[PDB]
């Protein structure tokens, strides 16, 4: 069966309530009153957290609340702390033994202030070269919060394929960063006078620049 | 206190067939039923089936049936899971749960509902072979430099399989350390960065070498970034 339907993400400030909707259809969420929900940390398993659409189990805070409405069952997160910060699954019975998951929802608690990105951009090394491969890196750091779209250019023109770019990870001093690679050639890279990559972060924009 | 312990991580290549194996502790399985759910990296939480040893014959899901089976050892409170014909769609940590999906009595349990999770078994299918990584470094410029510090760092390319450890002067340096998490490019291989902000003041004085292992391939390899 397709996955029950979540917010991608959802965000709130320390003690605000925040809400996280999962739809399904007549055969799962609006037939059985057997909704659940589970919290993961990252690089941890999910943790049990919410059954039978609005029960807690032993230990859960009851901070969290659960409630349904036709085929869409609601998770509300009712004073937001920092701990709350994680990745969010609902599940529901589908019959005949089967489960159904949800797409599952990034809920974010903007417990700091907004941190402009700092960008630096390094040419293919001499060592790498010689190797007959030129790879540019751009990195983005201390950033809040972590969420950033960047976009590499070659003379002014976009560049697209042969880039690969890592999701925001948090650093040491608990704001973002987040890497960018355009792998070329150095028969490519030499073809090209300038090279930039923009990094777009809570609508503004910042670009540095490299030259062959 | 009911824990569920998993095998170990694996590699494996496109088609052959995975085992992974969910063992309980402080509790009897067959008073337990396990579903098993995967998590591709980066992904979502997906269902693939559900045993119940008191109650016969296990339950699948739909994109599944066909290449996967449920198995339970009672007397070592042990269950098994097989996925045959691996691709390399099928990476993903791989989570056993406890489980009840019953209207009967969840002894010790809850109905409807994955209470107690495993820590997971890593699976990762490719093709690639095992590789070492390249460690090009990421020498400090102006471009770099601003307001007395500077960024330097390694590049890291190139290697099979996950993961590697990157520490700065033997792990004697970690202030303005940030080592990203890796890529996964067309050729198979993994790669990511590690950089490090440093007083422009030491530039010159001094080193800054990086430590790669991946120890897969047993490869070991310092850089000194100039």
């Known amino acids: 069966q397709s996955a029950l339907t979540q917010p991608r993400s959802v965000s709130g400030s320390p003690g605000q309530s925040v809400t996280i909707s999962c739809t399904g259809t007549?055969?799962?969420?609006?037939?059985?009153?057997?909704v659940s929900w589970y919290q993961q940390h990252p690089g941890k398993a999910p943790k049990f957290i919410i059954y039978?659409?609005?029960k807690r189990p032993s230990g859960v805070p009851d901070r969290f609340s659960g409630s349904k409405s036709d085929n869409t069952a609601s998770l509300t997160i009712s004073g937001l702390q920092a701990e709350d910060e994680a990745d969010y699954y609902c599940?529901?019975?589908?019959?005949?033994?089967?489960?159904?998951f949800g797409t599952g929802t990034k809920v974010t608690v903007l417990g700091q202030p907004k941190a402009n990105p700092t960008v630096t951009l390094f040419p293919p090394s001499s060592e790498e070269l010689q190797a007959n491969k030129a790879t540019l890196v751009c990195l983005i750091s201390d950033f809040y919060p972590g969420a950033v779209t960047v976009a590499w250019k070659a003379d002014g023109s976009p560049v697209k394929a042969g880039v690969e770019t890592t999701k925001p990870s948090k650093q040491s001093n608990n704001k973002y960063a987040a890497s960018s690679y355009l792998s070329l050639t150095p028969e490519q890279w030499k073809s090209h006078r300038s090279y930039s990559c923009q990094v777009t972060h809570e609508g503004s924009t910042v670009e540095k620049t490299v030259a062959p | 206190q009911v824990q569920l312990v998993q095998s170990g991580a694996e590699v494996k290549k496109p088609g052959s067939s995975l085992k992974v194996s969910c063992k309980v502790s402080?509790?009897?399985?067959?008073?337990?039923?396990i579903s098993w759910v995967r998590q591709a990296p980066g992904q979502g939480l997906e269902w693939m089936g559900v045993?119940?040893?008191?109650?016969?014959?296990?339950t699948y899901a739909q994109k599944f049936q066909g290449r996967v089976t449920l198995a339970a050892d009672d007397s070592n409170n042990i269950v098994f899971m097989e996925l045959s014909s691996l691709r390399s769609e099928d990476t993903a940590v791989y989570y056993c749960?406890?489980?009840?999906?019953?209207?009967?009595?969840?002894?010790?349990?809850?109905?409807?509902?994955?209470?107690?999770w495993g820590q997971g078994t890593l699976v990762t299918v490719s093709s690639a072979s095992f590789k070492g990584p390249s460690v090009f470094p990421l020498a400090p410029s102006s471009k770099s430099t601003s307001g007395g510090t500077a960024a330097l760092g390694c590049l890291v390319k190139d290697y099979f399989p996950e993961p590697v450890t990157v520490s700065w002067n033997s792990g004697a340096l970690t202030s303005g350390v940030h080592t990203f998490p890796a890529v996964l490019q067309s050729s198979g291989l993994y790669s990511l960065s590690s950089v490090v902000t440093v007083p422009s003041s030491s530039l010159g004085t001094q080193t800054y070498i990086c430590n790669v292992n991946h120890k897969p391939s047993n490869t070991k390899v310092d850089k000194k970034v100039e």
């Open positions: 599940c529901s019975f589908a019959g005949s033994y089967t489960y159904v």
């Open positions: 045993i119940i040893p008191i109650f016969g014959t296990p």
């Open positions: 039978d659409v609005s």
């Open positions: 749960a406890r489980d009840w999906p019953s209207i009967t009595v969840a002894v010790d349990a809850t109905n409807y509902g994955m209470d107690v």
């Open positions: 402080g509790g009897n399985l067959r008073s337990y039923g």
């Open positions: 007549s055969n799962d969420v609006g037939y059985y009153d057997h």
